[PDB]
Amino acid sequence: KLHKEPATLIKAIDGDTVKIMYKGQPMTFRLLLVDTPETKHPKKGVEKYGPEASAFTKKMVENAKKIEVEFDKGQRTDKYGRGLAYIYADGKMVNEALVRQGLAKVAYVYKPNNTHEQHLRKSEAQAKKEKLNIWS
């Protein structure tokens, strides 16, 4: 059973990555199950909708009263040291919000870290049907 834990925003870095204070330790977190266009793309740079995905995550985490992180059932950090997780801004899942707004695609999934996969795929189909941003 996944549960949420409190955390404190330090800084937003990209649409898909935020620095957070977790159990008193600053850490970089990668949002589970989504791929946003990047501004810090290692290869191409600042892709289309990159700045947009980026300001959205920023605003969202920044204006929140309460940030919480929720780990999935698999590994909790990636090979770069980044925490892997679902992030909640006042009860709303940032990863889902991005996909519903057409500012992220559901990422290639790695079990057993796939607990909200279906949900998100559902939000992606809707942003697609509404042809938003990425899907326009």
Curated annotation (Swiss-Prot):
Region span, Disordered:
116-136
Its subcellular locations are: Secreted
* Residue positions of the active site: 30, 38, 82
Detail which positions bind Ca(2+).
16, 35-36
Question: Where do Basic and acidic residues bias regions lie?
Answer: 116-132
Organism domain of life: Bacteria
The protein's name in its UniProt record: Nuclease A
Lineage in the entry?
Answer: Bacteria, Bacillati, Bacillota, Bacilli, Bacillales
